[PDB]
Amino acid sequence: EFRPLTLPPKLSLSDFNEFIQDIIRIVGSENVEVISVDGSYMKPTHTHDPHHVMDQDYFLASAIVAPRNVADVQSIVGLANKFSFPLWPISIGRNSGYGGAAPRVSGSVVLDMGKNMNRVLEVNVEGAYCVVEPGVTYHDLHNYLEANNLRDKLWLDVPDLGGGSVLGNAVERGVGYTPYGDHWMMHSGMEVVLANGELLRTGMGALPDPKRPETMGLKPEDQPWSKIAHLFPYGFGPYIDGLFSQSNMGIVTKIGIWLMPNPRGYQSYLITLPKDGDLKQAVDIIRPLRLGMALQNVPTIRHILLDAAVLGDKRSYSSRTEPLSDEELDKIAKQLNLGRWNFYGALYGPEPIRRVLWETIKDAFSAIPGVKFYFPEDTPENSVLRVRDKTMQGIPTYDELKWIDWLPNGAHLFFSPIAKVSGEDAMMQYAVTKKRCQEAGLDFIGTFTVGMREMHHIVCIVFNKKDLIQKRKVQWLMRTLIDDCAANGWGEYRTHLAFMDQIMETYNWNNSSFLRFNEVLKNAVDPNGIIAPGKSGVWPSQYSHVTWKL
Amino acid sequence: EFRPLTLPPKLSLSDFNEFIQDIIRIVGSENVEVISVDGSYMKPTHTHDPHHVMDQDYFLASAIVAPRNVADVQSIVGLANKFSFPLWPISIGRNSGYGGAAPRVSGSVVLDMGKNMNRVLEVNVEGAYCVVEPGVTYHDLHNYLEANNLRDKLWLDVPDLGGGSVLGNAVERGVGYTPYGDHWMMHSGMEVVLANGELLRTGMGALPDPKRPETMGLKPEDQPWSKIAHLFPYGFGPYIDGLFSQSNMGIVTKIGIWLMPNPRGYQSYLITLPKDGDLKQAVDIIRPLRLGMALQNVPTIRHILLDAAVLGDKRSYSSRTEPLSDEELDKIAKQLNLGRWNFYGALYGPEPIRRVLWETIKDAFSAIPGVKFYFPEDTPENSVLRVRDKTMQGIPTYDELKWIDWLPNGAHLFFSPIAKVSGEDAMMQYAVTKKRCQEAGLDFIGTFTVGMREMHHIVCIVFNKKDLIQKRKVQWLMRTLIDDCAANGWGEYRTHLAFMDQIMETYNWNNSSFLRFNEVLKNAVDPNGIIAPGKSGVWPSQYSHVTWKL
Amino acid sequence: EFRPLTLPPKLSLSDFNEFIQDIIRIVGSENVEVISVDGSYMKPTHTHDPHHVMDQDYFLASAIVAPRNVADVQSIVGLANKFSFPLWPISIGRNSGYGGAAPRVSGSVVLDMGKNMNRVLEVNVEGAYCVVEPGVTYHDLHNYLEANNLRDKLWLDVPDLGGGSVLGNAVERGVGYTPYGDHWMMHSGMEVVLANGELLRTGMGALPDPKRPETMGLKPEDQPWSKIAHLFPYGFGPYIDGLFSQSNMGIVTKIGIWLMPNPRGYQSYLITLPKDGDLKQAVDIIRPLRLGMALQNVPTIRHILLDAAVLGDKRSYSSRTEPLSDEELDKIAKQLNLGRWNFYGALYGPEPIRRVLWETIKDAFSAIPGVKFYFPEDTPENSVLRVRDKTMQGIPTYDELKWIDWLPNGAHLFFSPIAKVSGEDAMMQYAVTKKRCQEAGLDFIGTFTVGMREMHHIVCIVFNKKDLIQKRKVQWLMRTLIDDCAANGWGEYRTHLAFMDQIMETYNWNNSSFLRFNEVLKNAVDPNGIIAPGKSGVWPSQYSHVTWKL
Ligand SMILES: *Cc1cc2c(cc1C)nc1c(=O)[nH]c(=O)nc-1n2C[C@H](O)[C@H](O)[C@H](O)COP(=O)(O)OP(=O)(O)OC[C@H]1O[C@@H](n2cnc3c(N)ncnc32)[C@H](O)[C@@H]1O
Ligand SMILES: *Cc1cc2c(cc1C)nc1c(=O)[nH]c(=O)nc-1n2C[C@H](O)[C@H](O)[C@H](O)COP(=O)(O)OP(=O)(O)OC[C@H]1O[C@@H](n2cnc3c(N)ncnc32)[C@H](O)[C@@H]1O
Ligand SMILES: *Cc1cc2c(cc1C)nc1c(=O)[nH]c(=O)nc-1n2C[C@H](O)[C@H](O)[C@H](O)COP(=O)(O)OP(=O)(O)OC[C@H]1O[C@@H](n2cnc3c(N)ncnc32)[C@H](O)[C@@H]1O
Ligand SMILES: [Cl-]
Ligand SMILES: [Cl-]
Ligand SMILES: [Cl-]
């Protein structure tokens, strides 16, 4: 194809067209779309940010390219190094809230790995693991287990939604709710295409499977893996796998992600916290039970607007452009039979043990007045515990999407600071953030996910993607929240295309020692800067901080 | 000081002497000893391998240098880059079995970080963590907790011996026995001196603590850390902390290692497996209970000679140069009231729960004939369960050292392959190894440590460091075992100075993609090759594979 | 000399000693002092900061070297480029409040240009200018005019104190009180030794004086200048003279600074502003009279503590460690017959014109209640108007030093933000700063100097250089004030050795475009980084931001 709306840096039109042609020849006309509107969580867009904060085509691809297999990826990379064309690799592109399929650098080629590279490569029962390609979404993994009847032996671990890529999420260091929630910490042996085009397999993935007739002559991409590949992440020597998470270090072709065997028992529940101020004691409560294991999976403490929101649009709670007052929340909270702050968790294993865990949990939370316990049964058909019920057992849903719906053309943007598991610290953070959401004229909506000795505070910024004034308040809110929290000793864990530089600038101990070490490693392996420049604020030297940052 | 026995590559004598003098001026005459015999686990040697396989001075330092604080380290590194002098950083030097304090490259300066850099920087109770300097050994950490009465709130996690460095062990990706056994996976935020001399703090360690009077003007080495430093290892962006384990990437000045709160209950035990062949069913038994959590800490399956050995010298079991026969083992096993294979584990938490866990464990192992359960009580004063009892609760010992004593001038050397948690695979591996120990004329002695979906097979090679013929059989055994296991799809997790190249050559999938990626990263950050060249077989380009490997 | 306390980067001791010897041979043993306490405004120290905020020897010289003439400077620079020794050029070293004689980089050689290079090169009456060497202080210039009877034709322009260098002050873009106060804007044609060692003369200084017998064969340093050198700063082409102010671009050997002819009339005065809040209207008052010229020189608006302070130690006003309250100020103000805010100015020229100017000024200030006008006559012998009287006519003093005396071992540190000439903006700034001085436990003391369309807010931080706790509060105050003002759209005009990086980081529009442009220019001309690295936060590339900034 002929003439894009946007060309990558320094590339002439003829060069775009030459590269472009070589590629049609590699992948098929069908595997490429040059770009001369947003879409659906259901039929996601690859060209840009659908939940866009900046201008719609602000971050935009020059062309979309679908590798049919690992070889193509090696081919595109060779060509990208020839022309100095930057690549923006995505698995599924559902990173909405963080940018979606959009590239940090506009005019880049978007590589949707997931279209043709969809395979469940293996589900190992004794080893209790699966091996996967980017196109493998969570629902897909589920359906794979169902139709192969694996449901009874092994459980999945899902984030709030069903359409994400098991792989991409893991690279982002994503999170889910079972005891296997730390996604990234669950991986073992992965394969990546380096910037040079060469294939690499990490850990025990480097120890080659022994030779045999059946396996002779297969392309490396195609070789089976050694016995320990997916059971011990370390392998031998420097443990380099992390340079692959939230980095521009390579293209991930496959990965092993550990699976939880059916636990022999499961009980999910809700505990409503009546007062806004209760977040305080609840957190001090959650603290020792988490370190101690009465608390198993990653439990979550939700704010009322989030459940109110899965339930209905702002408009069906109040016709007020303004943010709802603290009294209107208490009202909604009551109508819903929920609290100010809502706690979801789940029990795992023999009833005899669940029994004892629950007696302990139920007892600790009791120091909180007006506290109330429920089981899915004990609640309505449209309840959130009902949904999260499936969620805490590895079963995929999409009901949570309706929360994005609070506003007319709602779009989400995530502020994702981390806080200690201290009522005090959590209260402090909620304050700082809440206040600012206010000055911006927005309802504060959020949830803290309970790590073992840390918490992920996911502030859900919802806004009308069609309101310039607002969209502008959102960029002001963000950058401000970012500075305020850092001022308080807290930094974000993951972020959107537009705040990467800002957030990385936050991580400045000792004159930016961290970005600098990072820069040195990226230039070594990506001398031509072709793979995702700017990601996490890491820039190839070919990219000017003056021209590039934001 | 004047004239070493061995000079690093290409350095003239005058240069040695100049560098050497600059350094006395930096650290004090007292912090340095130029080298113009082996010693004790109790008073370890810094100059070379005490448990030496090769010739005694085979791997040897030119001088020993003790930095008084992080600044010195920055100073020595600047000087080392001036003269191109290689550094060999050690915390405590107890890596006997792997080389001890000895440097891969002889003539290097040995840096004992641990002498002056001994401090417990912090023990955080709410956060359930400690922050440490290299000189901090395990006993020391223990005594620190005792004398500050912290014993009742938090538990340590120790490897078999008490003298190691909490830090150094962790970098090596060492292992211990409580539920917090994966040492490395327990760290959060560490500080390292890069090859360039610049300071770096990982993860949330990069998010700087906010400013305040009390903290103004302190050297960076000296600044407190942000609130989340030690509670969430990830921070933001590429997770680079692993380039710091078993690598030549930097000098570790400090590290945060997570602590287990007193569990409210603990019960340790032993289960004797009568037949040599029982390893098979036991492993298939251990398998689902480990994935499921009836098995908590890292349990261990020991071979009889190991307990026989903590108990007494080969000489007090039999005067036979030859290896003891399979019948003599069954005899020793009986005299000791132990099995062929011995299983140690421990229970944690409320009796009500331990109760249920133990009923399940006790019941599974019963399909094994002649099986027998014991509690420390149920056994003698000199028993191993008695020792491991302290061990599985974080309490430090040294009784296990006597096993090194099997032979007259016993020295240990570790073959450390990894095997699946399959009776079949474990049996296969034990075979291959056992056979070879035989052809070498040596008693096979070993233990498998139970990971969750993998096992660490620690083969304990004991030999007389004073017997040339033998020492030679040992090098033959090793290199052979190394090739045989790889041929079987298994590779080692950690190794001695002398087998690093060999072992790394094993990890060759796709034309050595792994060592090559590694090499590229090291040259970038260590353009002058000054930090530990050759470690894990990773060589700076200034170092010739032809001249350097083994 | 033998062995310094501190060596510059990467220099060996022998190298220090070699360089050092070459230099004794160039300048005389007498012109050099190697350093193997603070001193006096009267006998200033060249080795470090006397008014030190950080640790005393924090910023410190390796050796002090006194060039006897421009050739030596060319010689030292050649040697400094040989060894890569950094130079820290000072004229007189009275930059106390900003660091004094101390070098940004410790171990640098301090060059006191002023000792041997003291000459008044010319005082041109028709052209109304003087030409000078660094050692030429203000008193000296005065005495030069007196003893050559030039007092009646031309007037000097002095800052608050008499000991500064006319030259050094100008480079710093210093300020004084007559109509010729913008020191830097008063210069024409200067001479500098480039980093390469070559001599340069700016503007019309490049147009060579025509040839003649009398002038034949003189060294260039020694050649007279063309007729227009000191009368039109521009010359022809790029006007590069500014790369010489507050920069590391070169060593200034001489400079032409324009002189004000005796005006034919002079009247100085004071106007007391009764209320703290009066700063507001007064500034709105000063505004149009300044743009219009009823206001001539640079008038100053002082805070009461400053006059109180020239008058007496905190101790003789109150024994209170705490800061004096707003009521105690009103008291002091009354005892002194002064206001809350005090305004000093001076009239110039024919009485007939002064007459009209004064009627206008006197009339505008009258909208302020309790306002009062005075002439030196109308006030006491120890008054500040009495001192500033000489000051506003170019006559040098030192009475103002006593203000440094507020505290026991008082030391000053200047926060020097700039504010609009708006009551509103000035009030806002005073607020922000005042508040912080409070949280630090310090009396706020300051003065705004009236530029024509801007004001220099000189906040005078006085502290006890011998109090660690305090010294620490001072560093906290500073860095905080720095961030707060920038947050308010205001940045500092000049600063201390310790806040240069911080302040430059403030000037970040468009990804730091400014420091970057600057860096590019410095490396070009100072490829070896030998001249003042770090000044104004500008670092040679040989200097690591990670190792260097603060
Ligand atoms: C809107 C929303 C989002 C959301 C959520 C709830 C709602 C209402 N709940 C989340 C949760 O509970 N946990 C979580 O981790 N994320 C949550 N999200 C955000 C988002 O939906 C998920 O993170 C989602 O799984 C991510 O989108 P997807 O999985 O489709 O990933 P992607 O768009 O392909 O992007 C991945 C990013 O990582 C890098 N990447 C991706 N693929 C590769 C390959 N092959 N190689 C190298 N890097 C890769 C890129 O940086 C890409 O941008
Ligand atoms: C003889 C023996 C050994 C042993 C054991 C039982 C016996 C009888 N049981 C072990 C166990 O249960 N678990 C385990 O991990 N190791 C076991 N060992 C082996 C050994 O004793 C321990 O691993 C011991 O803790 C290690 O010795 P030490 O802790 O003193 O470490 P070191 O000699 O200082 O060496 C550490 C190596 O790692 C790198 N290193 C060390 N310090 C630094 C710093 N500051 N910066 C960067 N790298 C560092 C070096 O490569 C050094 O060689
Ligand atoms: C304590 C104090 C200070 C003060 C003041 C009142 C008090 C109580 N009032 C001031 C005023 O009204 N106006 C003003 O400009 N400054 C005021 N100060 C501060 C200080 O005393 C003066 O600025 C003083 O004139 C500066 O000290 P000095 O004149 O001795 O300068 P120096 O120490 O030599 O430093 C000059 C700096 O500029 C660069 N420099 C100096 N010489 C050279 C040469 N030859 N070549 C290149 N650069 C040069 C250096 O950066 C040096 O640090
Ligand atoms: Cl999701
Ligand atoms: Cl040990
Ligand atoms: Cl002055």
Side-chain angles (χ1 to χ4, degrees), chain B residues 399-414:
Chain B
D399 315 47
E400 318 205 38
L401 279 186
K402 313 161 190 177
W403 73 243
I404 301 168
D405 268 304
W406 190 238
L407 307 187
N409 297 289
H412 69 327
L413 173 65
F414 300 109

Side-chain angles (χ1 to χ4, degrees), chain C residues 5 20 38 52 55 141 301 489 542:
Chain C
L5 298 182
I20 216 81
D38 311 315
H52 54 74
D55 333 23
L141 185 57
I301 307 177
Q542 25 280 318

Side-chain angles (χ1 to χ4, degrees), chain C residues 153-164:
Chain C
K153 312 184 180 181
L154 302 169
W155 283 10
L156 292 182
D157 179 315
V158 306
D160 298 339
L161 284 193

Side-chain angles (χ1 to χ4, degrees), chain A residues 335-541:
Chain A
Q335 317 175 9
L336 301 186
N337 297 319
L338 302 177
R340 260 304 199 86
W341 287 107
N342 307 133
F343 182 88
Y344 302 72
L347 296 162
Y348 304 96
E351 180 292 328
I353 299 181
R354 279 177 276 155
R355 187 191 178 196
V356 183
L357 293 173
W358 181 245
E359 285 293 321
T360 299
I361 300 180
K362 203 173 185 176
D363 197 22
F365 279 80
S366 295
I368 312 298
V371 143
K372 297 178 197 169
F373 307 83
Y374 307 67
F375 293 156
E377 278 298 352
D378 308 351
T379 77
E381 317 186 12
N382 69 343
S383 70
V384 171
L385 184 56
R386 283 185 170 192
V387 185
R388 303 196 59 80
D389 184 51
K390 312 186 184 177
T391 298
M392 293 168 287
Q393 57 186 300
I395 307 176
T397 68
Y398 307 92
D399 315 47
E400 318 205 38
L401 279 186
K402 313 161 190 177
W403 73 243
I404 301 168
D405 267 304
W406 190 238
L407 307 187
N409 297 289
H412 69 327
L413 173 65
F414 300 109
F415 172 68
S416 316
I418 297 294
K420 279 179 168 185
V421 190
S422 167
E424 161 189 284
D425 198 50
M427 209 68 195
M428 200 169 72
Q429 186 178 106
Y430 170 51
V432 171
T433 298
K434 191 194 169 189
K435 172 198 180 194
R436 307 289 193 170
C437 285
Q438 283 59 167
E439 306 170 358
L442 284 183
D443 289 309
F444 160 90
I445 307 194
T447 308
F448 299 75
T449 71
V450 198
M452 175 81 172
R453 212 173 213 104
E454 147 281 293
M455 283 190 288
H456 276 38
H457 180 13
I458 305 301
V459 170
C460 319
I461 301 177
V462 314
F463 62 96
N464 190 338
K465 69 173 66 172
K466 302 178 182 180
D467 183 353
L468 298 62
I469 293 57
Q470 194 163 43
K471 303 176 65 180
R472 294 181 196 98
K473 291 191 173 184
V474 187
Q475 305 172 206
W476 172 92
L477 181 61
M478 263 292 200
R479 322 209 94 115
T480 315
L481 276 173
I482 294 167
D483 300 329
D484 288 325
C485 303
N488 279 283
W490 302 301
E492 295 65 55
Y493 100 107
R494 159 154 51 159
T495 328
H496 177 284
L497 291 181
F499 307 87
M500 293 190 181
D501 295 308
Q502 196 180 341
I503 294 165
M504 176 76 70
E505 176 57 14
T506 271
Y507 289 90
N508 65 36
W509 182 79
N510 195 216
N511 304 315
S512 301
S513 192
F514 188 89
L515 178 51
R516 293 319 149 204
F517 178 75
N518 283 284
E519 290 177 337
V520 165
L521 304 179
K522 168 61 171 184
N523 286 297
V525 308
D526 193 12
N528 301 333
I530 325 303
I531 307 307
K535 169 59 183 177
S536 305
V538 178
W539 297 97
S541 65

